[PDB]
Design an enzyme around this catalytic site. Sequence first.
Site, PDB file in Angstrom:
ATOM      1  N   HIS A  85      16.174  10.618 -26.044  1.00  0.00           N
ATOM      2  CA  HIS A  85      15.746   9.629 -27.029  1.00  0.00           C
ATOM      3  C   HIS A  85      14.225   9.675 -27.187  1.00  0.00           C
ATOM      4  CE1 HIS A  85      19.843   8.167 -26.788  1.00  0.00           C
ATOM      5  NE2 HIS A  85      19.637   8.013 -25.502  1.00  0.00           N
ATOM      6  N   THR A 144      13.491  -2.200 -27.598  1.00  0.00           N
ATOM      7  CA  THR A 144      13.786  -1.804 -28.959  1.00  0.00           C
ATOM      8  C   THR A 144      14.827  -0.701 -29.027  1.00  0.00           C
ATOM      9  OG1 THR A 144      12.077  -0.229 -28.862  1.00  0.00           O
ATOM     10  CG2 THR A 144      11.397  -2.382 -29.694  1.00  0.00           C
ATOM     11  N   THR A 145      15.358  -0.309 -27.867  1.00  0.00           N
ATOM     12  CA  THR A 145      16.459   0.605 -27.820  1.00  0.00           C
ATOM     13  C   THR A 145      17.560  -0.152 -27.061  1.00  0.00           C
ATOM     14  OG1 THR A 145      15.997   1.641 -25.705  1.00  0.00           O
ATOM     15  CG2 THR A 145      14.731   2.494 -27.549  1.00  0.00           C
TER      16      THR A 145
HETATM   17  C1  LIG Z   1      19.799  -0.678 -16.573  1.00  0.00           C
HETATM   18  O1  LIG Z   1      18.402  -0.960 -16.399  1.00  0.00           O
HETATM   19  C2  LIG Z   1      17.591  -0.531 -17.435  1.00  0.00           C
HETATM   20  C3  LIG Z   1      17.226  -1.388 -18.483  1.00  0.00           C
HETATM   21  C4  LIG Z   1      16.342  -0.932 -19.458  1.00  0.00           C
HETATM   22  C5  LIG Z   1      15.843   0.375 -19.383  1.00  0.00           C
HETATM   23  N1  LIG Z   1      15.018   0.803 -20.349  1.00  0.00           N
HETATM   24  C6  LIG Z   1      15.220   2.077 -21.016  1.00  0.00           C
HETATM   25  C7  LIG Z   1      15.148   1.686 -22.510  1.00  0.00           C
HETATM   26  O2  LIG Z   1      15.320   2.886 -23.248  1.00  0.00           O
HETATM   27  C8  LIG Z   1      13.825   1.003 -22.938  1.00  0.00           C
HETATM   28  C9  LIG Z   1      13.203   0.788 -24.141  1.00  0.00           C
HETATM   29  C10 LIG Z   1      11.977   0.180 -24.078  1.00  0.00           C
HETATM   30  S1  LIG Z   1      10.926  -0.224 -25.373  1.00  0.00           S
HETATM   31  N2  LIG Z   1      11.006   0.780 -26.448  1.00  0.00           N
HETATM   32  O3  LIG Z   1       9.637  -0.249 -24.798  1.00  0.00           O
HETATM   33  O4  LIG Z   1      11.196  -1.510 -25.882  1.00  0.00           O
HETATM   34  S2  LIG Z   1      11.548  -0.156 -22.452  1.00  0.00           S
HETATM   35  C11 LIG Z   1      13.029   0.513 -21.915  1.00  0.00           C
HETATM   36  S3  LIG Z   1      13.527   0.528 -20.272  1.00  0.00           S
HETATM   37  O5  LIG Z   1      12.795   1.550 -19.599  1.00  0.00           O
HETATM   38  O6  LIG Z   1      13.168  -0.748 -19.735  1.00  0.00           O
HETATM   39  C12 LIG Z   1      16.235   1.236 -18.348  1.00  0.00           C
HETATM   40  C13 LIG Z   1      17.104   0.776 -17.361  1.00  0.00           C
HETATM   41 ZN   LIG Z   2       9.515   1.994 -26.760  1.00  0.00          ZN
END
Ligand SMILES: COc1ccc(N2C[C@H](O)c3cc(S(N)(=O)=O)sc3S2(=O)=O)cc1
Ligand SMILES: [Zn+2]
Length: 256
Positions: free
Chosen positions: A61, A195-196
């Site tokens: 992604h 945002t994902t």
């Molecule tokens: C299961 O636990 C988890 C929960 C969340 C995540 N995320 C991966 C996401 O892709 C994502 C997207 C983010 S954004 N574009 O900054 O808003 S920050 C983020 S993450 O690293 O926090 C990983 C493990």
């Molecule tokens: Zn991001």
Amino acid sequence: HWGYGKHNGPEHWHKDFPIAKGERQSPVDIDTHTAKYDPSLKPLSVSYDQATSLRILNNGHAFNVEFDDSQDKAVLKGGPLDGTYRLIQFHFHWGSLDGQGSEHTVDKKKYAAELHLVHWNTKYGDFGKAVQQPDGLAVLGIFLKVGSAKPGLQKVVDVLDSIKTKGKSADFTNFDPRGLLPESLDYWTYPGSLTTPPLLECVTWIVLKEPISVSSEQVLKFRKLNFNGEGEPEELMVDNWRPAQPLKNRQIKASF
Ligand SMILES: COc1ccc(N2C[C@H](O)c3cc(S(N)(=O)=O)sc3S2(=O)=O)cc1
Ligand SMILES: [Zn+2]
Ligand SMILES: [Hg+2]
């Protein structure tokens, strides 16, 4: 499974993650004229001088640069935050063209990319617990504008050939995140979400007013990445951004 294509992109996310239709989803449009200047906002404190980067990884992604967050090595305090937030990784969202790529827009204007420095609130013991909380994460968002090269970005740009396809990683130690900050730390802040997927509403968004510049050849390099794993048909990693969501009874505060 989710992505940014016609068949699995943002408009479809709600079917597997219903929170996509929630009350404090990100990104949003920052309308500068109705953001409230709040005089009680303290300045941000970005202490990235002891940062330890470990690795860069293409995850299908975006590519993430991961940091060792076992101790308070690179933290963010101040601003709207109560508590210390540790840096765990940063990534970017970019477009196929220079006129799109940011997630947040300022007065509907879109930038070529947006850098997200993800931090989790240390009172919750680990990242996993932090994402279960309304104030679990703070993400520092920086707009990237095309112009002159940002010298601190070039190390990232040069390693992108080793991590072209989904799942590849390369060791990436001793990268200093301070070379990606603008001069000013003036900002906008509001409560929002990732945002994902999983789109959890765990985030205090801190969006810096000042964009950084990158050259078109630096941002060109971003566009050569692949969403696909190797051996699969090639899909270029471009336009990995979510469109703005309704602000729905939130006010954006400005530190200026
Ligand atoms: C299961 O636990 C988890 C929960 C969340 C995540 N995320 C991966 C996401 O892709 C994502 C997207 C983010 S954004 N574009 O900054 O808003 S920050 C983020 S993450 O690293 O926090 C990983 C493990
Ligand atoms: Zn991001
Ligand atoms: Hg949450």
